[PDB]
Amino acid sequence: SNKFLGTWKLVSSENFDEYMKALGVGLATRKLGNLAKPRVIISKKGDIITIRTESPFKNTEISFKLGQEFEETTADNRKTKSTVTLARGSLNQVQKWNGNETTIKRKLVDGKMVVECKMKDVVCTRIYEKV
């Protein structure tokens, strides 16, 4: 949709250390992971949507079509088979690799974006503010 379109800045994070931990990320990447206030820039050109995560430490851009499947390289070097769906105001995301699987849900709450990350027995909640 749109409500997503714009520039968002990280404001609050919760249980991210364990989300990473649970992803298999090692100490190094984690100290950095924890210490960052990323900026996300969702943009739409035609039917291709872009999600861009910027931080001093690392960048990440992804271009998808809702419904269609795509190959995404994570910020942690993983090579994933992701799908992005629109279900009742939230942009759910599915990442599959090997036999593992993680989900990222982006919902709009009081002009805030609430990012919910689940990885088997683990949820982390990162809040973002617009602009």
Ligand SMILES: CCCCCCCC/C=C\CCCCCCCC(=O)O
């Ligand atoms: C939040 C990505 C930028 C962090 C840089 C440090 C390297 C990240 C290590 C593991 C990242 C796991 C993927 C994070 C998903 C969060 C998505 C979002 O917050 O919009």
